[PDB]
């Protein structure tokens, strides 16, 4: 809850990868202390992967930006259509949310300014010896990251 372990995962939430890679390469069983260290490191690897996964599934995922929209609320005065009204709040929790009428965002929006999302397939094979070797058999705690790398592979054999 306090100390070194709490310090090591607030650094990985904000932006700091190089001081956290250097610690977990020295003491590789700093995992089995918290199950949050493998969730927040799968938030950084999923940001680098996401421009590549949208382009490999090219025409489908580019129009998937337009499929995500909601239904308006239709009242029966003249049978008119009005949109829904929400309002933002900036919180300290890293994962984005949406309650009954309130949506929550992370307060520090420049968290990904030092990172760069990598190119097609030749850069994925180099950057996975660093990130994916720290959490070795712990990629199965993020099942949505294991499903994304397997669709890069099928889409690369077929093209």
């Amino acid at each position: 809850l306090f100390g070194k372990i709490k310090l090591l995962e607030r650094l990985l939430i904000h932006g700091c990868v190089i001081p956290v890679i250097h610690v977990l390469k020295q003491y590789p069983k700093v995992l089995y202390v918290s199950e949050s260290l493998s969730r927040y490191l799968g938030r950084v690897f999923e940001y680098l992967l996401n421009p590549l996964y949208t382009s490999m599934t090219s025409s489908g995922e580019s129009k998937d930006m337009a499929t995500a929209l909601m239904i308006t609320r239709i009242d029966n005065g003249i049978l008119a259509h009005k949109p829904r009204l929400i309002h933002k709040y900036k919180t300290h929790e890293p994962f984005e949310s949406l309650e009954l009428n309130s949506s929550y965002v992370f307060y520090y929006s420049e968290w990904n300014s030092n990172l760069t999302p990598f190119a097609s397939v030749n850069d994925l094979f180099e950057n996975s010896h660093i990130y994916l070797s720290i959490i070795g058999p712990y990629l199965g705690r993020i099942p949505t990251l294991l499903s994304k790398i397997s669709r890069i592979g099928v889409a690369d054999i077929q093209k």
């Binding site: 239904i71 009005k82 949109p83 829904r84 929400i86 309002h87 933002k88």
Partner: protein, 104 residues
């Protein structure tokens, strides 16, 4: 004199953000492809923004711009009773019989 200038620049700071009376927002939309609306980027009308900016621009009398509201506040129901009467029944009953005679 400095003990008076220092106190009147703390109540100027404490009047721009802290107590700071603001407008009540009516939501108007025109495009039918929005479906989500965050209530942060609601800005007022173009005719009201030009009137409110004239209270703080220099070299103006206050009572001459307070009468531009009484002009504006009565031009806002002279366009809400012009579309609240011609849309009331003169265009309702043109769609009453004409949608029955389409069905027949």
């Amino acid at each position: 004199t400095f003990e008076h200038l220092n106190r009147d620049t703390l109540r100027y700071i404490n009047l721009l953000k802290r107590l700071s009376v603001d407008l009540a927002k009516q939501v108007e939309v025109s495009d039918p492809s929005v479906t989500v609306y965050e209530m942060d980027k609601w800005v007022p009308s173009e005719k009201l923004q030009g009137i409110l900016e004239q209270y703080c621009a220099p070299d103006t009398d206050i009572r001459g711009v307070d009468a531009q509201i009484k002009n504006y506040l009565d031009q806002i129901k002279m366009a809400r009773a012009k579309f609240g009467l011609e849309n009331k029944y003169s265009l309702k009953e043109r769609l009453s019989t004409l949608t029955k005679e389409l069905n027949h």
